[PDB]
Design a protein around this ligand. Structure first.
Ligand SMILES: *[C@@H]1O[C@H](CO)[C@@H](O)[C@H](O)[C@H]1NC(C)=O
Lengths: 48, 48
C-alpha cells in the first residue's frame, strides 16, 4: 500500500473532516546564551 | 568567555617604522552570543 494518502478536503465536509492549519512552537532549553525575548519597556524618565 | 565572543579593537597611526613605544587602551567593538568551542584560528589573505 502507498504510505501517503490524499486528504481530499472539501468545504461541504464536516467540522472533523474540515482542513485545519496547525503551528507548533518549540522552545529550546537554556544551553546557549539567550537570543529571544519579549518586548518589555514602558515609563518615562522623571528626573529630580 | 562563558559562551560570548568578544572583539576589542583600536586603530593607531604609526609614528615611526614598526611597533612604537606607547600606551593606548583597546575599546570593545563587538560582542557575539555564539556559545561554541574555539581552539584554533587563522588569518585570511588575498591576491590581486
Ligand atoms: C568543548 O567545550 C566543552 C565545554 O567546555 C567541553 O566539555 C568539551 O570537551 C569541548 N570540546 C572540545 C573538542 O574541545
Amino acid at each position: 500500500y502507498f504510505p501517503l494518502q490524499s486528504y481530499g478536503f472539501r468545504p461541504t465536509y464536516g467540522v472533523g473532516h474540515q482542513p485545519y492549519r496547525v503551528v507548533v512552537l518549540s522552545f529550546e532549553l537554556l544551553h546557549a546564551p539567550a537570543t529571544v525575548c519579549g518586548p518589555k519597556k514602558s515609563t518615562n524618565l522623571v528626573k529630580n | 568567555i562563558d559562551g560570548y565572543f568578544k572583539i576589542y579593537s583600536k586603530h593607531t597611526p604609526i609614528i615611526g617604522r614598526d611597533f612604537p613605544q606607547g600606551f593606548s587602551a583597546l575599546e570593545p567593538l563587538v560582542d557575539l552570543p555564539i556559545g561554541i568551542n574555539i581552539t584554533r584560528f587563522q588569518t585570511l589573505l588575498a591576491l590581486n
